[PDB]
């Protein structure tokens, strides 16, 4: 019910981050601004 999701970038698609969400409270994939070390700046991040 609390799986480990991974957060890939939206420009270079590198899987930079891993965290946990709830699956019944959040059926759709998270979107967060996080730092991308390849791009050198904050990009968007969805799940996979």
């Amino acid at each position: 019910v609390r799986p480990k999701i991974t957060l890939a970038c939206e420009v270079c698609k590198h899987r930079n981050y891993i965290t946990k969400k709830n699956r019944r409270n959040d059926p759709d994939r998270l979107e967060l601004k996080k730092f991308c070390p390849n791009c050198g700046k904050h990009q968007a991040h969805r799940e996979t």
Partner: protein, 62 residues
């Protein structure tokens, strides 16, 4: 005959230029989600074998 070296401990320890015996650090292979980045950075790199272990570790490399 001839003294065989321990094949396991020679894949885990090595020597520097002066004679210190370095090693890596545990707890950094899996189950890395709940470990914050202040912990996975403390376990990064190499450290010196402690002063109490360095007799048995030397005798397994020789």
């Amino acid at each position: 005959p001839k003294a065989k070296t321990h094949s396991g401990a020679s894949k885990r320890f090595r020597r520097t230029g002066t004679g210190k015996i370095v090693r890596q650090k545990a707890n950094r292979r899996h189950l890395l989600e709940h470990k914050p980045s202040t912990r996975t950075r403390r376990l990064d790199g190499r450290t010196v074998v402690a002063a109490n272990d360095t007799k048995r570790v030397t005798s397994l490399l020789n």
